[PDB]
Amino acid sequence: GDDRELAILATAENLLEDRPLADISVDDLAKGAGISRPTFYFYFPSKEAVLLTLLDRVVNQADMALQTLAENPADTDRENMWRTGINVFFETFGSHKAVTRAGQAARATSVEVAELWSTFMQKWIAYTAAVIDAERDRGAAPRTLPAHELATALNLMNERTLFASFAGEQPSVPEARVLDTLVHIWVTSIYGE
């Protein structure tokens, strides 16, 4: 039941490795899921709601992993705490690159994709700013920019850089170098005076 639903999601994610949402039909999704076209429409109002759900699941998987990290701190130096947190996004979205690239293209046309994006970007920026403020209160980082504006620009940087890398856009940081590159920019901008 939820079984046919998972099959429809697994098929869309496999086909999105191969072509854009525009070149995938509902019949392709039903064919791969082993169901009819009207049975598809029982589970999803459209192929776009299928993308929306896949993106929702990827975003919630990152959010949950971050929640886990936050509750039980990886005890390590400061550099490593930031590395570990950015790696959540690198590994989560990096394990679903076709969803990430399709979700990105859809932010342009879909009001629901734009809102899901915006809700989670705000949540992760607020968390990031809470960590920078924690570090400033303990005296580990200087009071330079407003924490919240710093956290917005660093999160936007990661979103754009991670996503260019995963799509291999011209130009982009190679995926094997993108984590070191981001952590250097984060640690220097947060701790630097």
Ligand X SMILES: N#Cc1ccc(N2CCC(CCC(=O)NCc3ccc(N4CCCCC4)cc3)CC2)cc1
Phi, psi of 82 (to 5 degrees): -70, -40
Min CB(25)–its own copies separation in Å: 18
Which stretches of the chain bind ligand X, using CB under 6 A? Answer: 55, 59, 66, 69-70, 81-82, 85-86, 89, 103, 113, 116-117, 120-121, 124, 127-128, 131, 155, 158-159
Our finding on whether 188 is near its own copies (CB under 8 A) is yes
**169: DSSP letter:** -
In one letter, which amino acid is 28? D
Q: How many residues bind its own copies (CB under 8 A)?
A: 39
Let me know: does 106 contact 59? Beta carbons within 8 Å. no
Min CB(32)–ligand X separation in Å: 24
Q: Which is nearer to ligand X, 18 or 75 (CB)?
A: 75
Select from its own copies, ligand X, none the partner in contact with residue 81, using the beta carbon and a kind-dependent cut-off of 5 to 8 Å.
ligand X
| SS3 label, residue 17 | helix
Which residues have C-beta within 8 Å of that of residue 158, sequence separation ≥ 6? 86, 89, 182
Segment 124-133 long-range contacts (CB within 8 Å, at least 24 positions apart)? 124/63, 124/66, 124/155, 125/151, 125/152, 125/155, 126/151, 127/66, 127/70, 128/154, 128/155, 131/85, 132/190
Given the rule CB under 8 A, which of 31-39, 57-65, 89-97, 141-149 is the region that contacts its own copies? 141-149
Q: Which is nearer to ligand X, 40 or 83 (CB)?
A: 83
- Indicate which single residue of 5, 56, 173, 175 sits in contact with its own copies (rule: CB under 8 A): 173
Select from ligand X, its own copies, none the partner in contact with residue 55, using the beta carbon and a kind-dependent cut-off of 5 to 8 Å.
ligand X
Helix (H) or strand (E) holding 89: helix 78-94
Which residues have C-beta within 8 Å of that of residue 37, sequence separation ≥ 6? 26, 27, 30
Take residue 134 and report the two structure tokens written for it: 């924690």
Our finding on whether 144 is near its own copies (CB under 8 A) is yes
Select from ligand X, its own copies, none the partner in contact with residue 44, using the beta carbon and a kind-dependent cut-off of 5 to 8 Å.
none
Q: Which residues bind its own copies (CB under 8 A)?
A: 104-105, 108-109, 118, 121-122, 125, 144-146, 149-150, 152-154, 156-157, 159-161, 164, 169-174, 177-178, 180-182, 184-185, 188-189, 191-192
